[PDB]
Design a protein around this ligand. Structure first.
Ligand SMILES: [K+]
Ligand SMILES: [K+]
Lengths: 127, 127
């Protein structure tokens, strides 16, 4: 509500998708995923540090944990592609900030082979 | 220096490119552009409000002026594609913040026909 973002995922394969993110202040973040062109089966799904796709998904750099210094964040959890190669899921994650110094706006989402199949930069979208 | 960003531009044509941005604190922003697949001649080059490419470059929303309330910002200036369809330029703009509430990180860059030929979300990249 209070804030929304989106990432369009593409890569060096036919994998493509869209992920929307919605968070009120610093509350739970609701995440809607639909990705296509995947091989059926389990895939990794992670936040990465940089929203840089100039060298494909390798440029997105390291796995990013927004809550590193706080007293698995960034691993959104494995997703399952169905026999049609489609992964369509809704998640609620309490460690995906859209605000603050470690906000993921301008960083990246990456889908991993269980290696970087597709990725996208997290951008702002109308509230 | 102090901060860097990048956008990869693509659209509903063969236009594609990369723009890097570099700013020390809130000083002048240095902008390196290389875009290809353009028709030779003058093109618009603007900041737009949302880093949303889910419906192509139309989803990037309105022209964005970061300095609207301060006492042409967002128009980066027309660029020229050469006879090879390539626009390769370096600009220094004093109205492209990478920091603050009106930061362009997570927003969009769009190349216009003189209408939205290509666009990309502004993402963070290693300093
Ligand atoms: K939270
Ligand atoms: K400035």
């Amino acid at each position: 509500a209070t804030k929304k973002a989106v990432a369009v995922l593409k890569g060096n394969s036919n994998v493509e998708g869209v992920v929307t993110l919605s968070q009120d202040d610093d509350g739970p973040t609701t995440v809607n995923v639909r990705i296509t062109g995947l091989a059926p089966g389990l895939h990794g799904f992670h936040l990465h540090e940089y929203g840089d796709t100039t060298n494909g998904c390798m440029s997105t750099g390291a796995h990013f944990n927004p809550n590193k210094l706080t007293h698995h964040a960034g691993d959104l959890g494995n997703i399952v592609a169905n026999a049609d190669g489609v992964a369509e899921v809704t998640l609620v994650d309490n460690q995906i900030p859209l605000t603050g110094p470690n906000s993921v706006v301008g960083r990246a989402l990456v889908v991993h082979e269980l290696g970087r199949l597709a990725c996208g930069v997290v951008g702002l979208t109308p509230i």
